[PDB]
């Protein structure tokens, strides 16, 4: 479909990209996409129209009158999100990830480990839970005070966040922010 002329994007990432153009035009269409018009022209119908097909049932002529199918009544958006929304099955991926048959595999390996054996790669896998460094020196001890780490409709993606947009009903941080004892002396 020629994917339209692609040279318009060039670099210039998100916060400088002009606006999306459905037909190389700065406009929106659809009620939930930001356009003030939905459907053909604020209407349900289509350009050509729509008519039902002829009907005839005589215990042998209704056999030609087949049933209804998913695709024949949907549109391009509907099929696109139908493709997007199909997620199920999985099974085998969940079983061997994140051992089961691998235990039988260890039976094949003749593990006989008793006490397990570890490698300095696992000390580097611990490094996955240590740091990535913060541009500091080797001996830098750093400081502990300088380290840091409900629903409904939205206020609008352009209306931003502030003190205004937090949960007035709060019951979080039960005990994780509080000590269990304090020195008295």
């Amino acid at each position: 479909f020629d994917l339209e002329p692609s040279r318009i994007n060039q670099g210039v990432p998100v916060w400088k990209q002009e606006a999306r153009d459905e037909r190389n035009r700065k406009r929106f269409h659809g009620a939930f996409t930001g356009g003030f018009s939905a459907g053909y022209f604020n209407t349900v119908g289509s350009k050509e129209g729509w008519q039902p097909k002829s009907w005839k049932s005589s215990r042998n002529e209704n056999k030609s009158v087949h049933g209804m199918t998913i695709d024949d009544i949907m549109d391009e958006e509907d099929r696109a999100d139908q493709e997007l929304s199909k997620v199920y099955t999985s099974k085998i991926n969940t079983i061997d990830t994140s051992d089961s048959i691998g235990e039988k595999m260890l039976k094949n390996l003749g593990w006989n480990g008793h006490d397990f054996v570890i490698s300095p790669f696992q000390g580097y896998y611990d490094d996955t839970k240590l740091t990535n460094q913060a541009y500091h020196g080797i001996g830098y001890q750093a400081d502990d005070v300088f380290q840091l780490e409900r629903g409904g409709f939205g206020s609008g993606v352009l209306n931003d966040d502030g003190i205004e947009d937090q949960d007035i009903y709060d019951l979080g941080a039960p005990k994780m922010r509080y000590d269990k004892s304090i020195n008295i002396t």
């Binding site: 595999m105 094949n108 580097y124």
Partner: protein, 321 residues
């Protein structure tokens, strides 16, 4: 340096304090021609704590080729091999389970059918080799061979940092494929051999000729590799339908599938949040289902490479059998 995560099949570039041996080598680097001084930006007390020598790459790489090698020699029990340093057991079992789900290993852990032994004979990884070995059943070995040669050789596009980047985009503008980067690479390779190996053409199109030559050597050697099994290598698809090439790829990249999320990221089949790299054409096309090859992980986002679109019913029919 680079550390790979087996649980997530990712790889990350992390900063590590140097070893004592590396510090000694760096100190001795200066002083070859005349007397020289070194100024290491730390204290001797800091030097007193680092580990002496950097760990081996046999302890810092993917052992799946190693397991293929040992299994090809005929070692049923991996523990019998005399490793200088014992590799992580969890890595070995992860690699073996990956190989099992790939089909190269049976339930007993032995090579499965001619497939397992033929994969063991291949220099490449088992994932890429599966597509090549299964391409014989579908009569389209040529294009999958080109894909493998491009993948193993590396990046076939050159990206300048000056204003010629726009010129590079225009140079690439002739070969943008709607179906992903993989078919774009196939088209580029086809017209590359169709352009008389002209070096001026490679300059004009900003194309890395060295990578293409190396891909040529790779494909010739893999042609010899298939002919070792008496597999003909004149099989091409006369039809424009790349669907069955995609079936072979999905047989080769079973684990590497993902579908778009509303937030702009993609959900892997394994429930992993990944982000598409900016280099790929399908950066914002919002393709519903995607398939990648390699994952490189940064401190916040997991980026995927070699992006190619797929259709859901192929995946459904492949998983059920």
């Amino acid at each position: 340096q680079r550390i790979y995560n087996p649980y997530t099949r990712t790889s990350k570039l992390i900063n590590v304090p140097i070893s004592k041996s590396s510090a000694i080598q760096r100190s001795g680097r200066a002083g070859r021609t005349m007397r020289g001084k070194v100024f290491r930006l730390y204290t001797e007390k800091a030097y007193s704590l680092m580990k002496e020598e950097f760990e081996a790459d046999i302890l810092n790489c993917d052992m799946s080729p190693l397991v293929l090698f040992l299994k090809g020699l005929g070692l049923k029990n991996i523990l019998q091999f005399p490793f200088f340093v014992r590799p992580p057991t969890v890595h070995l079992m992860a690699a073996l389970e990956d190989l099992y789900l790939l089909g190269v290993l049976d339930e007993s852990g032995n090579l499965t059918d001619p497939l397992g032994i033929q994969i063991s004979n291949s220099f490449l990884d088992a994932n890429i080799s599966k597509a090549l070995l299964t391409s014989n059943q579908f009569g389209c070995t040529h294009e999958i061979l080109s894909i493998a040669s491009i993948l193993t050789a590396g990046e076939v596009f050159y990206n300048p940092t000056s204003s010629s980047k726009n010129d590079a985009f225009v140079a690439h503008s002739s070969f943008f494929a709607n179906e992903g980067d993989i078919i774009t690479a196939l088209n580029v390779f086809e017209s590359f051999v169709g352009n008389k190996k002209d070096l001026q053409w490679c300059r004009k199109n900003y194309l890395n000729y060295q990578t293409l030559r190396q891909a040529l050597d790779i494909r010739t050697h893999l042609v010899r590799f298939l002919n070792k099994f008496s597999i003909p290598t004149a099989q091409r698809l006369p039809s424009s339908d790349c669907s069955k090439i995609l079936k072979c790829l999905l047989d080769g990249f079973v684990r590497n599938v993902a579908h778009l999320q509303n937030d702009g990221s993609y959900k892997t089949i394994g429930g992993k949040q990944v982000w598409l790299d900016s280099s790929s054409v399908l950066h914002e096309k919002k393709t519903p289902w995607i398939m990648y090859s390699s994952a490189v992980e940064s401190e916040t986002q997991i980026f995927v490479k070699n992006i190619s679109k797929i259709e859901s019913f192929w995946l459904d029919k492949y998983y059920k059998r």
